[PDB]
C-alpha cells in the first residue's frame, strides 16, 4: 500500500481517458463517496475512501486485493488496464460497440470483433480510440482498440476486424 | 422363428475365428506401402485395415446373434425345452 | 451444430408462417430418424414443451425430448400415443416421411403419398382444434389428390418447398394451418382406397 505520485496518476488517467472521454471528472469528484485509489505491489486498486483508510492496518505481505483492480504498472513504466475495470468503465463509456448473439462466444474466447455484426454503434469514432464492447440487456463484455473509423467499417467485407480485442470477461474462467 | 433350427452359420472356436477374420484382412486389403509415400496414403491404408477387420468380427458376431433362436420370445414349449436340454441362464450368458 | 440438413427447413418455415412453433406447447413428431425436427422443436417451443417423437428405427434418447422408437402403421403404437396423449391433444403434428429412395421413382413417390395418409390418420385422431399439420410430400401423379383432401379437412392449405432444400429434389413442405375437428368424419374419405381412385377418361 502507497499513495501515487504526480506523474503516476497522469499515466492512469490518460489510459482511462482512452475509453471514457473527458467524463473522467465523474470518477474522482463525488463528495459523498469520493473513491480514492491506491496500489499494492505495483497494481492499482479502486475503492471507497474510508474502506482504504481503515485497511492501512493490513501488512503488505498479508494483503491480496482491494475492491476493484484497474490494472498493473508494467516493468517498462506503462499502465495496463485489466478486465476488472469494466464495472467502473462501462458505466461511463464514450465509444460503445455491440455484437451478435451468435457471434458472442468467439469474442468470449479471445478472438477479435469481426464486421459480420451490423446495426447501431457509436458515431464520431477515431481509428485508434478505445472502444467498450457490449453484447437485449446491455451486458458489458470488455475493452477494445478500434480497427478503423465508423465510416470505413460500414463499407467492409464481413471477415475484417472492427475492434481489436484487449480484454474480455471470459478471463473470469481462469 | 418356427419349429426347428438347422439353418445356423457355424461357430468357430475363438482361436480359428481369429484365424478367419485376421487372414481375410491380410488377403482382401492392399498390403504393400512404402514409407516414402505421402502421409495421407499411409493414414488411409491403415484406416482401411482397422475398419475392415472391424466389419469382419462384427459380421461373424451378427451371424451368431441373429442365427440362434431368441429363447424367451419363441414359444412356451421351446422356451422351456431348451431350458431343460441346456442351462438357460448360461445360454443367455 | 444440429444433427441433419433436414433441420434448416422448418426454422425457415416458421418465419414464413408466423412462428407457429413458437406458440405451440405439445408436438407429435413423426418419421424423425435423425433428431433434426425435435432439436428445432426444442429451441422454438417454450421450456418443458414435452414433445413426442415416433420413428421406425430404434435409436438413442435426447435430453428434454421423449421419443418412442417403433412402427407407424400398427395399432399398438397408436396405443402408445393412447398410452400417453389422451389427456393432452397436440398443438402441431410434424411429418418428415421419407422412404428408402432408389426404386423406380413411381413407387418412391407413391409409398410417400401412402405414408402421409397414415400420418394424417394419426394426426386427425390426435390434434387440437385449429392447430396445424406440416408434411414432407413428393410432387407426383397423386399430389393433386392429397392437396384436395387437405383442403376439405383443414382451413388454409399452403405448399412451399422453402430455401435450404436440395433444389433438385422433388420435395414439398405443405402446411395445413387450422383444423376442423369434426364430430362427423367421413369414413370412406380418409381411407387410401378411395383417395387414389383415378379420374375418368375424357
Amino acid at each position: 500500500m502507497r499513495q501515487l505520485t504526480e506523474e503516476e496518476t497522469k499515466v492512469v488517467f490518460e489510459k482511462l481517458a482512452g475509453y471514457i472521454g473527458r467524463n473522467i471528472s465523474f470518477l474522482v469528484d463525488n463528495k459523498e463517496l469520493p473513491h480514492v485509489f491506491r496500489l499494492q505491489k505495483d497494481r492499482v486498486y479502486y475503492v471507497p475512501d474510508h474502506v482504504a483508510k481503515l485497511a492501512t492496518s493490513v501488512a503488505r505481505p498479508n494483503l491480496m486485493s482491494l475492491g476493484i483492480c484497474l490494472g498493473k504498472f508494467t516493468k517498462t513504466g506503462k499502465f495496463r488496464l485489466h478486465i476488472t475495470s469494466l464495472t467502473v468503465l462501462a458505466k461511463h463509456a464514450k465509444y460503445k460497440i455491440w455484437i451478435k448473439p451468435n457471434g458472442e462466444m468467439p469474442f468470449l474466447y479471445g478472438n477479435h470483433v469481426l464486421k459480420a455484426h451490423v446495426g447501431k454503434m457509436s458515431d464520431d469514432i477515431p481509428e485508434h480510440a478505445g472502444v467498450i464492447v457490449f453484447a437485449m440487456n446491455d451486458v458489458p463484455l470488455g475493452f477494445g482498440v478500434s480497427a478503423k473509423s465508423t465510416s470505413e467499417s460500414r463499407n467492409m467485407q464481413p471477415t475484417g476486424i472492427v475492434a481489436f480485442r484487449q480484454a474480455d470477461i471470459g478471463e473470469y474462467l481462469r | 422363428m418356427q419349429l426347428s433350427w438347422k439353418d445356423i452359420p457355424t461357430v468357430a472356436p475363438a482361436n480359428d475365428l481369429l484365424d478367419i477374420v485376421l487372414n481375410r484382412t491380410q488377403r482382401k486389403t492392399p498390403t504393400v506401402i512404402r514409407p516414402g509415400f505421402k502421409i495421407t496414403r499411409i493414414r488411409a491404408f491403415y484406416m482401411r485395415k482397422v475398419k475392415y477387420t472391424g466389419e469382419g468380427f462384427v459380421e461373424k458376431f451378427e451371424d451368431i446373434l441373429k442365427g440362434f433362436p431368441n429363447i424367451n420370445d419363441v414359444h412356451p414349449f421351446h422356451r422351456d425345452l431348451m431350458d431343460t436340454l441346456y442351462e438357460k441362464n448360461h445360454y443367455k450368458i | 451444430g444440429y444433427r441433419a440438413r433436414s433441420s434448416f427447413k422448418i426454422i425457415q418455415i416458421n418465419e414464413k408462417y408466423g412462428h407457429f412453433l413458437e406458440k405451440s406447447k405439445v408436438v407429435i413428431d413423426l418419421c424423425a430418424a435423425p433428431g433434426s425436427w425435435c432439436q428445432v422443436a426444442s429451441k422454438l417451443c417454450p421450456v418443458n414443451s414435452l414433445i413426442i417423437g415416433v420413428d421406425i428405427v430404434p435409436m438413442k434418447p435426447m435430453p428434454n425430448v421423449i421419443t418412442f422408437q417403433s412402427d407407424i402403421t400398427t395399432e399398438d403404437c397408436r396405443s402408445k400415443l393412447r398410452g400417453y396423449m389422451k389427456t393432452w391433444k397436440a398443438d402441431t403434428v410434424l411429418h418428415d416421411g421419407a422412404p428408402n429412395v432408389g426404386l423406380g421413382w413411381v413407387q418412391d413417390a407413391f409409398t410417400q403419398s401412402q405414408l402421409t395418409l397414415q400420418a394424417l390418420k394419426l394426426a386427425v385422431e390426435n390434434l387440437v382444434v385449429n392447430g396445424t399439420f406440416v408434411t414432407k410430400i413428393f410432387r407426383s401423379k397423386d399430389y393433386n389428390k392429397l392437396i384436395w383432401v387437405f383442403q376439405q379437412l383443414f382451413e388454409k392449405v399452403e405448399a412451399t418447398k422453402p430455401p435450404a432444400s436440395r433444389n433438385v429434389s422433388a420435395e414439398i413442405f405443405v402446411v395445413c394451418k387450422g383444423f376442423k375437428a369434426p364430430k362427423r368424419l367421413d369414413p370412406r374419405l380418409l381411407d387410401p382406397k378411395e383417395v387414389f381412385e383415378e379420374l375418368p377418361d375424357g
Binding site: 471507497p48 481503515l54 498479508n62 491480496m64 486485493s65 475492491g67 464495472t87 470477461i169 | - | 421450456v47
Partner: protein
C-alpha cells in the same frame, strides 16, 4: 441388531468404522435411511442470482429463453433457482461471466440468511474460501461501508479475487491472515461471519476422502482450532454468526456450547428465518441445553440440501 447395519455400511458404502459408529448412536434406523441413503444425490443444482447487477424477476426470463428449467426453493428467498434440465454450458454462459449469478449449493445460502447485514456498517471475516457467501454479504449491503474477506490459503485467494470482481462487490478488503491473531490486526466493532473449519465435514457425496480417511486425531485438533476461532470472533465486536458443514456433535453444539459458558456476554437468538428443525438438549452424556434450542438444523433427506448447522450470537458488553 446394530452390528449387522455396521457391516451394511462399512462394506456396502466402503466406510470408516470410526464414523459409522459415531453417526449411528442415538440415531434411529429411520434416520439411518435418511442420512446414509442420501450420499448419492450429490448437491442439487441451486443458483445465487446476484441482486446487485440484476433482480431475479429479470433473470428468470434470461435463462428460460435459452431453455433452462427453473423453479424457486420453498420459503427463504427467490434468489435460489433450482436447475433441472439445461444443455447450455453450466458455467460458460455469458451471464455467469457478467456477474448476474454465481453457481452455489443450497447449503451456501443459509449462514448468511441468518446474518442480517445493514447499511453503512462493516462485516469482518476469517475463512471464506470460494467467496460465494461474501457475495451475499455485499449484495444485501448494496455496496456500502466495508466488507472484509479472509481465508488462510494463498492458493485459494484466486477464487475470491475472481468472484468479487466477477460479481462486482467494490467494497472488499480480501487479505490473507492467520485467523487466531485477528483481533490484534484490527478488531472491528461491527459484526463478523465464520463458516466451516471442520474435521467432521458432513455430506460425503461432495468429498469421498471423508468416507475413508477420517481418524480421531482430526477430531482432537480441528474442533480445538474452531473453538479458538470463536474466542477471536467474540473478541471482534454486533451480531456474530458461526456455522459449519457437519452433522457430528463435536463440530457444532459442543464447540458453540463451550464459548457460551466461557463468556457471559454471549446470547443465542433465533438463528434462521423460514424453516429448519429443532435442536437437541442431550448429546450422549452432555450438558443441560435449554438455551441451545434456536441453533437450527438441516438434513440431506428431509430437504434437498447438504446437512449443516448454523449458530447466530449476540454480544452486549
Amino acid at each position: 441388531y446394530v452390528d449387522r447395519l455396521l457391516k451394511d455400511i462399512c462394506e456396502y458404502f466402503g466406510y470408516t468404522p470410526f464414523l459409522a459408529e459415531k453417526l449411528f448412536n442415538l440415531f434411529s434406523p429411520a434416520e439411518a435411511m435418511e442420512f446414509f441413503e442420501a450420499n448419492e444425490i450429490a448437491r442439487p443444482i441451486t443458483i445465487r442470482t446476484n441482486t446487485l447487477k440484476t433482480r431475479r424477476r429479470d433473470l428468470a426470463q434470461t435463462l428460460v429463453n435459452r431453455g433452462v428449467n427453473l423453479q424457486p426453493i420453498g420459503s427463504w428467498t427467490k434468489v435460489g433457482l433450482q436447475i433441472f434440465d439445461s444443455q447450455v454450458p453450466i458455467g460458460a454462459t455469458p451471464e455467469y461471466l457478467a456477474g448476474h449469478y454465481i453457481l452455489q449449493a443450497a447449503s451456501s445460502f443459509l449462514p448468511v440468511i441468518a446474518l442480517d447485514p445493514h447499511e453503512n456498517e462493516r462485516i469482518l471475516d476469517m475463512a471464506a474460501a470460494p467467496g460465494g457467501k461474501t457475495t451475499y454479504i455485499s449484495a444485501m449491503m448494496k455496496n456500502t461501508g466495508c466488507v472484509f474477506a479472509n481465508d488462510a490459503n494463498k492458493s485459494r485467494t484466486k477464487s475470491l479475487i475472481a468472484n468479487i470482481h466477477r460479481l462486482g462487490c467494490t467494497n472488499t478488503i480480501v487479505c490473507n491472515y492467520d485467523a487466531r491473531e485477528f483481533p490484534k490486526v484490527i478488531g472491528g466493532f461491527d459484526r463478523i461471519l465464520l463458516d466451516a473449519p471442520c474435521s467432521g465435514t458432513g455430506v460425503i457425496g461432495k468429498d469421498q476422502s471423508v468416507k475413508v480417511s477420517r481418524t480421531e486425531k482430526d477430531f482432537i485438533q480441528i474442533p480445538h482450532l474452531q473453538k479458538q476461532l470463536l474466542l477471536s470472533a467474540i473478541d471482534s465486536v454486533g451480531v456474530i454468526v458461526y456455522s459449519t458443514c457437519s452433522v457430528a456433535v463435536e463440530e457444532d453444539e459442543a464447540v458453540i456450547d463451550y464459548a457460551l459458558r466461557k463468556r457471559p456476554n454471549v446470547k443465542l437468538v433465533d438463528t434462521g428465518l423460514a424453516i429448519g428443525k429443532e435442536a437437541f438438549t442431550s448429546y450422549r452424556g452432555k450438558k443441560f441445553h435449554p438455551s441451545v434450542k434456536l441453533a437450527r438444523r438441516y438434513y440431506p433427506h428431509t430437504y434437498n440440501v447438504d446437512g449443516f448447522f448454523v449458530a447466530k450470537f449476540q454480544k452486549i458488553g
